[PDB]
Amino acid sequence: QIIKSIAAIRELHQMCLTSMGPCGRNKIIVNHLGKIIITNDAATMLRELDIVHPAVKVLVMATEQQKIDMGDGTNLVMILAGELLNVSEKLISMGLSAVEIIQGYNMARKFTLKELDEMVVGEITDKNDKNELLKMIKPVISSKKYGSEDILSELVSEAVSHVLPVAQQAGEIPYFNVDSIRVVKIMGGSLSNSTVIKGMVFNREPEGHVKSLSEDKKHKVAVFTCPLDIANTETKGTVLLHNAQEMLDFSKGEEKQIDAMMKEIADMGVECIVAGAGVGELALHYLNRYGILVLKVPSKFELRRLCRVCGATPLPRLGAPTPEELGLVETVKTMEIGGDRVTVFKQEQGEISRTSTIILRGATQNNLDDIERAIDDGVAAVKGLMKPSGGKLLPGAGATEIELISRITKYGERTPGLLQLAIKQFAVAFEVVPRTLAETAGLDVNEVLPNLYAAHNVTEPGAVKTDHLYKGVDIDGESDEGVKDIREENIYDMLATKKFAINVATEAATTVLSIDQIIMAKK
Template sequence: MSMKLPGNPNAGLFKQGYNSYSNSLDGQIYRSIEAIKELHKLCVTSYGPYGRNKIIVNSLGKTIITNDAATMLRELDVIHPAVKILVMATQQQNQEMGDYSNFVMVLAGEFLNCCEKLLTLGLQPVEIIQGFNMAKEFALKELDLISKEVEEGEGNKFVTSKFDPAMIRKVIKPILASKKYGFEEELSQLVSEAVVHILPTPSDERLLTEDIQVPFNVDSIRIVKIMGGSLRDSEVVKGMLFPMEPISHIKQANMAKVVVFNCPVDIATTETKGTVLLHNAKEMLDFSKGEEDQLDEMVKEIADSGVKVVICGATVSDLALHYLNRYNLIVMKVGSKFELRRLCKVCGATPLARLGKPTAEEVGFIETVKLSNIGSNVVTVFQQESSERTQCATIVLRGATKNNLDDVERCLNDGISGVKGLMKEGGTKILPGAGSTEIELVSRITKYGEKTPGLLQLSIKQFAKAFEVIPRILAETAGLNCNEVLPNLYAAHNNNQSDGVFYGIDVDGVEEDGVKNIKEEGIFDLLAAKKFAVNVATDAATTVLSVDQIIMAKRAGGPAVPKGPKAGNWDQDD
């Protein structure tokens, strides 16, 4: 009698619950491109100075109104693996250069739209990838040539020092205008003033004459939002500002030494419990006398060392506060370790993990500690008044509504992060903005494609055509007729041999043909940031093209808990 093994109905390559999407007749690449188109439509209408805002309700039920692509992609829970490739590309761009995240998403999505036409014609993905890589290398070389032409066309009118506020404003003004058009002058003034405060003193002549990398930390610039007033009431403080008062009786001081404690300002307690037997009233009165004398001695040592300001990152007991007030010390309690770290940078102090007399190296110095009224709010200002640099600056942001303040804060963060590209080696090289560089690339890459033999010229030409999406979206969001503006823009670039590269989209609609010379407006983009964006966008698009199968494992755990506001209950508060 033979033995038969029972058949397993779930026998297969993967465990039960796996999903496999292969490159069948309808094509996995086509389905990935269709999924990316949805996210592309979301970001493309938010590009440019007149980009549309989106209302996003995230998984926590918080409502966010913004047109910043990095914020939108961060708050959205993207599931599709192919779309996640583009999201990671935008995050890399935002982390490295601080801006152009929307540019990466729009350009990569348009690359894939053009790829769909090539796939329909019968080209293999490998041929498209090869043509795109050739076109990318040519485009990066042409961007260097365009930047050189811009410098020669402007002559000595360009300010090339990274320490000059005019150069910083020139770089960040287009970044801020794409988020808050109409307020770019005020915002760029705030950012440039804050950046100049924290840059190292250019005592070395090489820093002024040579284009070398300058140390710059984005976290050194802090933004404090205070309700009330308008955006034009905002200001920059060379130091730090806290929306609270000191807990001591003394509220202000000048030319004061500062000590920072990272531990509780109190008598240390034992780890074990004990029982104390008291025999009479005198022993009960003297029970805590030793602790009081010890705390009094500690505070006296701190005051005798010349310290006038005590910053505490933990709790301050009532008894310790009594003795600190007795010796006329300012006591400021800072709950955030990040704020405490920034305050140590401003004062030059070392945070201490023990309570006692600080050494001379551990003590910091602040020129002014004062109370100030901003609107109806009382704030404490730690400010360095001298002309020397400080390691932290604060932008005090004013506004009428919370959503508007949050949006302006995101805009300023993009502008501050955009300075990272300027401070890199070769960061002072710039390109014309307003879509002029992209139109110039369309013409030059198309000519390069016509000289390339074989089927590769089809993918190179489609690569060039994808750059047309930038000026087209700038014109559409500004309410212009693309069918009229784009031919005028091509004509302006071809007919003006000397200044042709400077012609871009007139988003204000002042010119009849929708085209203007942006040299006078000062709309320029950083060469390093745009080259990095083109590189990242091309790599993301070719990565999606190279995938022919998606295998997804079964999710771990039980069913997902519903997130966000319930259906029919959209009017509840955050």
């Protein structure tokens, strides 16, 4: 049954072989609601598909473990754990029990995780510079959207640097909230006209008669949760109709009261009123004559992030314009994005903001929708840089994979006993990573494999190789011959992603080998 369970996983394994890498294939997902979507990330595909088979549930639950704590490695945990079961087939047919196979991977896992600390090349200084963020974000954009890697590099790195404050050697105060970076898309135009602005972006239209405010800095903003209406009594206070004589007093009564309430509020100096609920017809006409911008925000989630930016606080009541709770904004205007004029929120060189929004433009919404998921995964890659050894990095694109194979085979001969068979098969399972990039790129697999081992195996006067550790697995697409160095384009995967993906894929692979029988009964 273990062999039969691998065959079912092998069908799922081949699905991820065409996923990882910039040359991979995308799969169309047709939802039961009549919506056709397509995405590169395999973790989204597992959510729309119903998982049943128990050996498949192990890799799916391990995939959700990769979604938290990081945004990269969704295809890494699936391909690595899937190959460990394929190389274990030779041990099962040989007659070796699956118990010692699991024990062999546990000994090789501790030797692998310990070597990753000594294989580090550079370390991120956490300078939060625009050029420093281009090294981490550029390889993350790759393998998802092709051709936008160089275009989206300057857009994502500039928006993240605005959220990240200026600090050094301080790990006590947490930062980098997930919702602080919002990605919106507008149909039409292209990515060349996209810029990076500090503030929230609203897609609602300026229903008020004031399209844009003045150029004076520090405009007060009043966030009102209670809708605009005549002041009522907290106890009962239900308006009832009796005779036609009282009908004239209802319209004339609310006309003077609403005009008097907005009067004193507008006289406090606040030029912007944010109403989280519906706005009345009579109350809208009064604020338009006083030069007050009316902005409705029905979403309660957008009002929470605004408190940390402008400084305003939502008031559950109406008619109490407290100046201590008012915020400040330099410029509030209405710009036309993609043909539609929407009121935006921004500031210049003041009142530092922890929340930013990226404005994107594109002709085709299909590929543009995947850009939002690619940037959201790129934002989560910034989380990989933390105080507990977050700045450590390793060369990617198959450079570390093949180089680690030669170091594992050295530990195999040094460890006596039956563990030698498990150590050798553990290093061979890493050959799926270079073959994945070589097969999806159209290059000959038999040509690339010997050229890799020839670069990683050299004769030097010493036990530590010096000159070139940077030889990777290159996607050529060129005419004749030659490759590129990892340090040239700075395309690599961080250590926090690789160390976490291998540790989870190792336990997930040994978990499938533990269950040799399934039993289903009525609950």
